[PDB]
Design a binder for this molecule. Structure first.
Ligand SMILES: O=c1ccn([C@@H]2O[C@H](COP(=O)(O)OP(=O)(O)OP(=O)(O)O)[C@@H](O)[C@H]2O)c(=O)[nH]1
Ligand SMILES: [Cl-]
Ligand SMILES: [Cl-]
Ligand SMILES: [Mg+2]
Ligand SMILES: [Mg+2]
Ligand SMILES: [Mg+2]
Ligand code: NA
Length: 327
DNA sequence: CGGCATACG
DNA sequence: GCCG
C-alpha cells in the first residue's frame, strides 16, 4: 500500500465503510479545532481503508499500512471488538462538534467564523437569523437557502442544469463547451453542488467569458445568488421541481484550453486526492502543481499537457480514471 | 524535528 | 497524527 492517495485506486464504494466513516469523524473534529495535521492523518488513514480489496476483520491486518499508528489503530480496534469507538461517539454527541458542523455547512461560513460564533454563545441557525447585522450578504443567502442546500443534489438533477448552462454559454460565446467535474464526474449519485468547467477550443477566446455567462443566466431568472473580471463563480441556482423549484449550489470555472487538463484534474477531485497529488508532485518530484499547470522551478518551465493522462505520465504515476480518485 | 495544497472572489 |  503506497503512502500517497494518488498512487493507488480508490473507488467510490468499498469494503470498509464503517471504519472509514469513524476515522472521518475524528478528522472533521480535528479540523474544527484548527489541527490541519491531525485532520490530514485521519483523512489519509480513512482513505487507506477505502483502497483495500476486502474488509478489515482483525487488527493484525493494519500492520504495515501507512497512516495507521497508535491512535488510528485503537479506533479500528474498538470498532472491531465492540462495534463502537467511545472517542468517536463522544465527538458525535458533543455540542462543539454538532454546532461547528451546522455552522460550517452554511455557504459563506468557514471554521474561523463558526468558531467565533460558537465562542460568542451562538448555537442554532435561528440564533444567527436573530442577529442578521453580523452576516455578510453571502452568509445571508447561505442561511436563507440553508434547507434546500442541505438536500442532496441528484444525478437526475444534473442533466437539466447542464443544458441551461450550455444554452447561456453558447450565446455568450459560440463554440464554448461545458464539462461536468467534481464529485459527479467521479461517479457520485448525489452531491452538495454541481461543478462545471467551461473552455473554448481557440486559445484566448475564453477571456471575459464568465461575466457574460452569469449575466445571461441572471436575465433568465435562474440565479438566486451570485457574487456580482472573474473566472470562478460560486452561485445558487433555481432548479425546477414538480410544481415548484429548489435552490442548488452550482460552481462555474473558466479555463483556457491550454490549461484545461490541469483545471479538469484539479476540479474533479476528490479534495484529498488533489492535496495528495500536489504534495506528491512537490515532495517526490520537485514540481509544483496547481489548476493552471505543472512547474519545474529549476528549469523555470511549465509542462504542456494535452490530457490528464499526460499529467499522470509526467509525474510518474499510473493513470487513474475519475472513478478511482475517490480518496 | 518539519511538514502537512492551492489560487481566485 | 503520522511519515520520513
Ligand atoms: O478545499 C477544496 C475544495 C474543493 N476542491 C476541488 O474542488 C472540487 C469540487 O469541490 P466540491 O466541494 O464541489 O466537492 P465534490 O464535488 O468532490 O463533492 P460534493 O460535496 O460537491 O458532492 C473538489 O473535488 C476538488 O477537486 C479543492 O481542491 N479543495
Ligand atoms: Cl502510480
Ligand atoms: Cl503531511
Ligand atoms: Mg461538488
Ligand atoms: Mg463545488
Ligand atoms: Mg511535532
Ligand atoms: Na461553509
Amino acid at each position: 500500500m503506497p503512502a500517497y492517495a494518488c498512487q493507488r485506486p480508490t473507488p467510490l464504494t468499498h469494503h470498509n465503510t464503517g471504519l472509514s466513516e469513524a476515522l472521518e469523524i475524528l478528522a472533521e473534529a480535528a479540523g474544527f479545532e484548527g489541527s490541519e495535521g491531525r485532520l490530514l492523518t485521519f483523512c489519509r488513514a480513512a482513505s487507506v481503508l477505502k483502497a483495500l480489496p476486502s474488509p478489515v476483520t482483525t487488527l493484525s491486518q493494519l500492520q504495515g499500512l501507512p497512516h495507521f499508528g497508535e491512535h488510528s489503530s485503537r479506533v479500528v480496534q474498538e470498532l472491531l471488538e465492540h462495534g463502537v469507538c467511545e472517542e468517536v461517539e463522544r465527538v458525535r454527541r458533543s455540542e462543539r462538534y454538532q454546532t461547528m458542523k451546522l455552522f460550517t455547512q452554511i455557504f459563506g461560513v468557514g471554521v474561523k467564523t463558526a468558531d467565533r460564533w460558537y465562542r460568542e454563545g451562538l448555537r442554532t441557525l435561528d440564533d444567527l437569523r436573530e442577529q442578521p447585522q453580523k452576516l455578510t450578504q453571502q452568509q445571508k443567502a447561505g442561511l436563507q437557502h440553508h434547507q434546500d442546500l442541505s438536500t442532496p443534489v441528484l444525478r437526475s438533477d444534473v442533466d437539466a442544469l447542464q443544458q441551461v448552462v450550455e444554452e447561456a454559454v453558447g450565446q455568450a460565446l459560440p463554440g464554448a463547451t461545458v464539462t461536468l467535474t467534481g464529485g459527479f464526474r467521479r461517479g457520485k449519485l448525489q452531491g452538495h453542488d454541481v461543478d462545471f468547467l467551461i473552455t473554448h477550443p481557440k486559445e484566448g477566446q475564453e477571456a471575459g467569458l464568465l461575466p457574460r455567462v452569469m449575466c445571461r443566466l441572471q436575465d433568465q431568472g435562474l440565479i438566486l445568488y451570485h457574487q456580482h473580471a472573474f473566472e470562478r463563480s460560486f452561485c445558487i441556482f433555481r432548479l425546477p421541481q414538480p410544481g415548484s423549484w429548489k435552490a442548488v449550489r452550482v460552481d462555474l470555472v473558466v479555463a483556457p484550453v491550454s490549461q484545461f487538463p490541469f483545471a479538469l484534474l484539479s476540479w474533479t477531485g476528490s479534495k484529498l486526492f488533489q492535496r495528495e497529488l500536489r504534495r506528491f508532485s512537490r515532495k517526490e518530484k520537485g514540481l509544483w502543481l496547481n489548476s493552471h499547470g505543472l512547474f519545474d522551478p529549476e528549469q523555470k518551465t511549465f509542462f504542456q499537457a494535452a490530457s490528464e493522462e499526460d499529467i499522470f505520465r509526467h509525474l510518474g504515476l499510473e493513470y487513474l480514471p475519475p472513478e478511482q480518485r475517490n480518496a
